[PDB]
Amino acid sequence: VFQQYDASSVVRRELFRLVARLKQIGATTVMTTERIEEYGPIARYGVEEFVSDNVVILRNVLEGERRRRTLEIL
Amino acid sequence: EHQAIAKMRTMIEGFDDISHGGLPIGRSTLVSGTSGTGKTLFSIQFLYNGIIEFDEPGVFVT
Amino acid sequence: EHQAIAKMRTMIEGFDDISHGGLPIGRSTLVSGTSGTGKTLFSIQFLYNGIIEFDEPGVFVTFEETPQDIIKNARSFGWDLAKLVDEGKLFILDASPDPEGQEVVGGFDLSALIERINYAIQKYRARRVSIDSVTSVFQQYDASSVVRRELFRLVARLKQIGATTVMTTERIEEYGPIARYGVEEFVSDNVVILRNVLEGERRRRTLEILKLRGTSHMKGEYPFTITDHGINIFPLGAMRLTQRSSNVRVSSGVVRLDEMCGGGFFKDSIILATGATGTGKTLLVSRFVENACANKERAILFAYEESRAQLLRNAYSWGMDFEEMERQNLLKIVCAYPESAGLEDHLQIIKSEINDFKPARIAIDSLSALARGVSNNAFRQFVIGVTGYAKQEEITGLFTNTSDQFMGAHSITDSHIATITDTIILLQYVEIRGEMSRAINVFKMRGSWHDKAIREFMISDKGPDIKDSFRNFERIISGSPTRITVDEKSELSRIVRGVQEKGPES
Amino acid sequence: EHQAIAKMRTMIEGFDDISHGGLPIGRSTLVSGTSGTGKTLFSIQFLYNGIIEFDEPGVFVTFEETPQDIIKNARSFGWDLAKLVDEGKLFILDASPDPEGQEVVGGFDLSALIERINYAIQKYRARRVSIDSVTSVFQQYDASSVVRRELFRLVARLKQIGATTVMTTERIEEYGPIARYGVEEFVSDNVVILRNVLEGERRRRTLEILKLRGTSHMKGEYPFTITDHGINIFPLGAMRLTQRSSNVRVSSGVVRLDEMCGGGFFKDSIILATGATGTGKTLLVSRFVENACANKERAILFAYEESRAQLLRNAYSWGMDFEEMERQNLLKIVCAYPESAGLEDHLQIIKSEINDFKPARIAIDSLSALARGVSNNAFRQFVIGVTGYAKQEEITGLFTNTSDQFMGAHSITDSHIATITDTIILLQYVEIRGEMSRAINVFKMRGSWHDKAIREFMISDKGPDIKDSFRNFERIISGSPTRITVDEKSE
């Protein structure tokens, strides 16, 4: 959604809104995000983390040509 | 309520273990990762195990 | 106390030492850190105790989290903040934006907030203040220039007011810049970094006090754990060296051994039992725990290799019934995997069980079990921990170390812990005539005199049988000894012909 | 279509094995990577195999090389694309800009183009469409957010059309972003990544399928070759452990040795001869290769240490004449320094050559010669490939290994190929009375019984002459013996 011409700030405030409204409803929501480097920031725009109540990371770590899939609960 | 945070079960083999019950209720849980790591399936499959195990309708936004 | 900056206590298991006292009164401490590091709890924990220990109302400003949740969440550690926001001891000050908000508002509001917080502080008569997630305020359209001036104003005014404040900062990298705008670090009087370093797919959190303008403190990282009780730190280096020592002597559960140790292990003493795999270590330990209960004293056993079940099967086979031990409430078996947590945790799990049961003895079967994966220093430092705790607590310790190379190991340490230890017990195989025989030896005893033989021992359903020494063998330790005889037929009981009887009658 | 995902094989050697079927029909695949990885070839080979195998018209779209060139170059792998253009089975929709022009033509053309695309799709009744260098289009003046929309509009349309696609994308760092804008990443249904990795000033090409929406695939990287017959991907992991096993026997070239191994080597099996430099491994190989010339059978010899010439010499010196072995086209020698290439290219040469001589025996002159300058893992993989290939092909294999230290060596192998070889012939110098004497031994044979003694032997112009064991010595293996001269029982 932010891939139209947005920056960090614009994007943080937006996640807040989204998450919050969803909080009111009482909806146990799950939100999927993309990244750039297996260990780099936790979310494309360096903010999504602190804005969420719970965070999870699905990593497909490289290494010796063999990829290894892991999951963590930050 | 007036106690701890209540959790929901994802019936995803293991995760409901690692998370000590499962996702918190009435709260969004961020799940990010690089292309081809899990996410969708983790979201789809969270919905699915929802219907198919406690009868809890699901809403998938794509 | 010799310091020139007045401090107030956080009552956070560990912090007040590392900070040599607690946050400098009338000042601002920046506790910064990655996502999920511990930050906001610290804050809440900081206001909490002030309330429930000094009766000092506190003002907690929330910026991102909903004033409702802060209370909802803080219930995890068992705190009815509600009731406090209710009795007028804790004023949560909402400032969270809205789900239907505009855009543009972080400068004149920064001036309004000062007056705000200034109202509640004057109103509730507060001493402590938490400003959780200032960062989020600048995350609207700002840059370094405007953040140092704006923060400054806030802290500057806050200090004038006389409130001992804590601000929280997020940061993407664990070791890199302290805070986002790489500017908060110099605007604050103190800086408390909180990290959660990865490495080896496990997770290690640490607290560090970079600076405390005005006084001294413990430098570098210190591991902490967030338990059902909140933050819990280990000044593994603030662990002074002044434990008590006593010439009291206890049993090993093995009689002959006792002699071999000048008269029974010292009460206050660390004991090490090293020996290749399958030499016996596990047994002795069991015979140590056993006896401790046979004299009516408590003792724990933390098995990191064998199950609680199996620990009993082989324990019973060796005699000594652990089933009962558990029941008479004299021996407690923990038992777990070293891979089921980072050392910091394992070190605390152990400490805990040592306080909810008060042993008078403790045994850790296979320290080397805990040295798996982990770095030597990391493990060596953990050894100093347990070893440290049990030493200053009059709790006799028997650790088990299994050397990675049977017969031919030129070092019974491998991780070099033999110098922290007070008394070592050595078990090693001996190749005698196409046979793998065993043999124990008492290497060192700091206070006792102990036997200097490398006696042989055998295992029966009954237990450790301490026989005689391989006097007529050289290159013993080598594992595969060399038979050089000056005698052997020498008296002892010559008398040939019919010497025995048999099973019928003697 | 309430069925699992449908795939369309690519007939690109090795890929259809890795994708578990082949790019999902009608969807978009994304093969991206840095300059010189495969991309352009891939897609080209993608369309080709599509035509000359299933009569499936191909739509190739270029955004930089001129159509004339795509042909010109293609002739590199023996295929006149001009022919299919004449036959209307493939349409190289030129879309490359000309020397002159204007600007401010943003999403302007991305639209008109989707029509010209749909055009030929319908017109040529297309099924497989490839787009090379799509990115060289947004490289006019755009940003991430801009590309995400110009790309998604396409793929979307394409999926509508229903044709199966592949999009070429470029990358700058071999292990950084998946595509220049790190957007295409998520805009694709399937992401393939060509990586032309450096290291040691040598280059290894590695393909990988990061994701395939809706179907399983092969997780991890795979080395691939670029030749005269297109791209080739050896799925060294894919190869299964279902090798044929027979109890038949073969000779070792040395009678007395055939005896030691209880009858001989098993036709189907790998044997390893180990020893310090000099021991005589190269002998055993020379002897093992003549025998297959006595039973008039084709056998191959891969030398990585000596030359065509020198071998001939030291061979005529042991009696065996190779000059005839070649004439009788029953023996073929190769020879190539290990440095001349990397294990990837090697493994192939081997395979290819084995197909053009239908051997029944084979011996590689020194593996350590090949483990030279390469990581164990990288080498360890090279063994299993040849070892594996020689196996499920019935070819008895004998490999040479000069242990890194003479006398006392504590392992037949260093790289650890011991557990990859069935039989282990172990050569080792033995020191007696001040003379470097030898010693051959059948260390292990999985089936047979083989001799358990360490028999010394010698080398004359007649070849190896196994002799008697060192019954009267001790520490034999160590290297520096110690006679026992036990004084009998002392009467």
Ligand SMILES: Nc1ncnc2c1ncn2[C@@H]1O[C@H](COP(=O)(O)OP(=O)(O)OP(=O)(O)O)[C@@H](O)[C@H]1O
């Ligand atoms: N049936 C299946 N069996 C085994 N693995 C599968 C199966 N389907 C998909 N996969 C694997 O899962 C990956 C697909 O990713 P998925 O659709 O779950 O979402 P994602 O990786 O989180 O996000 P994105 O849309 O970028 O791919 C593939 O890369 C593949 O390795």
Ligand SMILES: Nc1ncnc2c1ncn2[C@@H]1O[C@H](COP(=O)(O)OP(=O)(O)OP(=O)(O)O)[C@@H](O)[C@H]1O
């Ligand atoms: N009862 C508990 N037992 C063990 N861990 C707990 C408990 N309660 C909370 N935690 C842990 O505490 C952490 C919560 O972090 P906290 O609320 O203190 O603020 P933060 O990490 O500093 O900042 P942010 O709001 O950005 O996450 C999590 O990492 C979580 O696992």
Ligand SMILES: Nc1ncnc2c1ncn2[C@@H]1O[C@H](COP(=O)(O)OP(=O)(O)OP(=O)(O)O)[C@@H](O)[C@H]1O
């Ligand atoms: N009932 C028994 N009867 C005779 N010998 C026994 C009996 N139980 C154990 N043993 C002997 O004791 C050894 C078992 O080792 P033990 O359980 O004492 O711990 P360890 O050698 O210190 O460590 P680990 O067993 O994990 O290697 C065996 O090598 C075996 O010879």
Ligand SMILES: Nc1ncnc2c1ncn2[C@@H]1O[C@H](COP(=O)(O)OP(=O)(O)OP(=O)(O)O)[C@@H](O)[C@H]1O
């Ligand atoms: N006949 C051939 N034999 C061996 N290798 C060849 C042959 N033809 C081309 N190659 C190799 O294959 C590569 C060709 O790459 P190709 O033009 O197919 O696309 P690309 O490298 O993916 O993208 P780009 O258009 O940027 O070069 C060359 O870099 C070259 O090393």
Ligand SMILES: Nc1ncnc2c1ncn2[C@@H]1O[C@H](COP(=O)(O)OP(=O)(O)OP(=O)(O)O)[C@@H](O)[C@H]1O
């Ligand atoms: N005509 C010959 N007469 C006597 N001995 C010879 C003759 N030719 C070779 N030899 C012996 O064989 C050895 C030659 O080594 P060989 O060809 O067997 O290969 P290798 O030992 O396996 O490997 P490398 O040659 O690389 O050391 C010489 O060291 C020598 O002892």
Ligand SMILES: [Mg+2]
């Ligand atoms: Mg997805």
Ligand SMILES: [Mg+2]
């Ligand atoms: Mg956080």
Ligand SMILES: [Mg+2]
């Ligand atoms: Mg927080």
Ligand SMILES: [Mg+2]
């Ligand atoms: Mg044990």
Ligand SMILES: [Mg+2]
């Ligand atoms: Mg190209």
Ligand SMILES: [Mg+2]
């Ligand atoms: Mg995606």
Ligand SMILES: [Mg+2]
């Ligand atoms: Mg040699």
Ligand SMILES: [Mg+2]
């Ligand atoms: Mg050689």
